[PDB]
Amino acid sequence: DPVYVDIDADSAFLKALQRAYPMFEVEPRQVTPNDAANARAFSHLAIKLIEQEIDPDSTILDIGSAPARRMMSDRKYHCVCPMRSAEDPERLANYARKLASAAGKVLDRNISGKIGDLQAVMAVPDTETPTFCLHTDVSCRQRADVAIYQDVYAVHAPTSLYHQAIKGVRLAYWVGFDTTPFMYNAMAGAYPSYSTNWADEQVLKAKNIGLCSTDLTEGRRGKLSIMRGKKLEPCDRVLFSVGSTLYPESRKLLKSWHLPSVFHLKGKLSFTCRCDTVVSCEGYVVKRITMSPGLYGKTTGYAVTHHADGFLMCKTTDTVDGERVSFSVCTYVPATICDQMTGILATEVTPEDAQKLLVGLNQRIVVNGRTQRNTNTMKNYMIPVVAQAFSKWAKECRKDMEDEKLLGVRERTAFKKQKTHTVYKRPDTQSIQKVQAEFDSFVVPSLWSSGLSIPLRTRIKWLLSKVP
């Protein structure tokens, strides 16, 4: 039972993809020169793993999904599709066209039932149906067993999970990006394996980051300003860029999905929940959450992340709109590169010397002409940032050995705090953070109103008017 992915036949991502999914066999086949091929291959394989694991006799809920891709499926799906984005009208029209086109040919996947169910919702846009729905995750009144989240970042996590629990849901899944960089409160970052860059609005006019744009006509002295800012701190608004597509996000909702190991939900009913990580590959993670009634045990409120490759965060100096400032960035480093620099970092190294060594290790390494490092292991536009971080890290490690202190005592003059400019997490290392583990806020965001327009209803009904 082979699985076909839409990527090139000589891409270096095959080795990483196969290692993350050892229960399958991956075969490449390219039909489209998409700019985000890596990001779609992972999602395709993730769904396949989830489907075979669960009982094929249960009911599955989808939150903010596209019903078009759930047509040729042997399971039972309840799609929750509100109208709160500019992409929803296009998806709904495509679903209707595909249903009518494939009517009478594939009479095995319950096509007639889906066609009839869609028509009923169009006539009365307030009914609850086994296949289709038009409310939100809170207002929906359908009972099932499994809930699935796919690339959802616009819903508060403790609130959504509680509303699913009271309807008899005992299992959940979540697929998306890693939320670790947002816990360190960084200004900009990158995911080089998937061609993704993100930044804050206050640094959108930088010069040497992955997502910016500056000007050339300049060279003057003196810019009068009314307000005295003096402050650079991250704000709520964050912009994402995957390939050539833009997505706005918010920090508060992103940090709500960094759940602890054990937490309690209290209200009219009580539940105990656990979170676990199953698959991790260079930025995407798959999390499984289980719910159970009652109260059991005690919580501690700690989150643990395991690093398979190097994670780096440093401080850089750049010019924003012509003014020199400083802020922090983060990125990921391959494990092989980190291991081979152990001996060099034993002493103090000049940043320009480190840059030359990194270039040779990356694209000028050979062993027998068979494997090597595929002559491109780390993308070349992040080397100057990495070289700066290693130089600062080595310098700060030498000062520690020159300030040897006594055992079990501390000195107060009333104590001095040193300066830190680099945080470096080597492979096979874990990081721990403190979060909240007790939730009891039963907010009721219940203001229900439909978002279906008369012209859109006419178009959908007309596409289904003809049975062929």
């Binding site: 081979q340 001996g343 060099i344 060594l357 040779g360 290790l361 000028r364 390494i365 050979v366 062993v367 002409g369």
Partner: protein
Amino acid sequence: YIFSSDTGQGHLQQKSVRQTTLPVNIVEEVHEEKCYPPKLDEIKEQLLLKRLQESASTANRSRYQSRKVENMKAMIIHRLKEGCRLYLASDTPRVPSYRITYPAPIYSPSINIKLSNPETAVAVCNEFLARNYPTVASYQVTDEYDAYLDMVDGSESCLDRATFNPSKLRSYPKQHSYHAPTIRSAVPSPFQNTLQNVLAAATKRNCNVTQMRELPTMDSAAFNVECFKKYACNQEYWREFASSPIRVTTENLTTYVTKLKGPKAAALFAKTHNLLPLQEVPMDRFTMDMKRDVKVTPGTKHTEERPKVQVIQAAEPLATAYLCGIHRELVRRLNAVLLPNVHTLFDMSAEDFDAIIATHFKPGDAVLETDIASFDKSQDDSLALTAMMLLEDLGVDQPILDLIEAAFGEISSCHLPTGTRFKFGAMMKSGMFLTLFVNTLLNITIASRVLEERLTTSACAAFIGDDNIIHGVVSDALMAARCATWMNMEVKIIDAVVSVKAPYFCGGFILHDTVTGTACRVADPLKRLFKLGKPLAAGDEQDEDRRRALADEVTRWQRTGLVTELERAVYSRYEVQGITAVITSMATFASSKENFKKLRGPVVTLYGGPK
């Protein structure tokens, strides 16, 4: 010679270019070395010479020679540039090249062990010789009257196409003064320059005639180059190299002359008054030189038969100065087309060689070593055609090829003191400035054709001169059948096993360390031991460069983890026991100036003095 000579000068350089500071191999780019153009200045010499007279302790003289030699170098460039006006060209854009680097080697600690009394060291060495070599230790009973004994008996020779004057064949000995040796090894003295010795040296008969440049000769050469390019080279450089020729350029001459030393520059300057043009210099006329040193190997063979006499065929002095600027480019191009697992000793040092084979040779591994010295290259004319075909593919400019070809045909030699004329046919060994390069090319071609595809799939192969070593190859009947097309003794092959039968390469041993676990190369102790029993000519003051060479070689011998391996390697090669004591004896000799004086004795004078 190659690694190091007796005076520690060698043929290899001493600058590392194949070293990296990382635990993995890294490919890099080959760059060029800029040379300082010499300049002329006469006013400085005049004032410095006058300032030399008024006061000169030690450094004042040195400034005069530096100024004087610098003036000579500029004059040579000006005169040499004018001669080759029809062949001079300019600089064209160059073709970039790349090379592989290796990490630094690791060595074990060394501990010095030596005796105290220098006379006891001589007794131990003499005892070692008598126990293992009985006949060699009893030869010397009187003085060195070898010259007289050679005169009493007549002259026997086997000549071909030679003329000489019988009235000048007389060999009465001249005065001979030397120092009596202490070691009882009977190493002979260099021969005297007489007509009898010249005829004895030229007792070689290689008269063989085949198809000069006909169809059968071309067919064999065409196959030979096909095997070389298919089993030992990659295909990424041939078409680019053919487009860009190699021509004589001012930068080639300027760089070459600047590298010469003091005395060499002065000798070349003395032959620039009547400067012949490049097209006027004959390329097939040679002179005969005799001044050499006899070569002796361990064993008992020089006490029963007289050794041969070595000769040198010297070409025209101007011929080797006009065209010697293209050797560097030829080396670079050859290294670019070879496979990564095939190596050549050109442009390396001692440290670079150790780093390459550091993690390839392990105990229980079969190594094939083969030499091609015992082969008559004058019988077949296809051996010269193959070299020219390889040279043409490398991108040599056409008129220059004609000058090179003229030296590989019919040549003549003359002995100035006696007016003796010799004529030879096709010859490969000579004194021209392409001898190692052509021999290396032929050595690789012969191995590639015989071994076929077994050369491509290998761990490490090294070729230099007439010696080669190939890893993981044994002797089968297929190579015997392939090589038996004409005869059977074309080449000599020897099978070696690491830690059981140590391989031999360029007068050394390849051993695997025990403490660290890496391969290394060391020298031959028995070859040195027989060499200390060589008489020293009176008036020689070169007894200080040899002590430093011995001191360096002794230290490498006493590394921990190599004492036991060295004992087994010598026994498996020469069947001799008890060499640790000899090494200890060598240690105390190379400890002080006075300790080195115990190897000599009183001066003996023969055939001199009318008293």
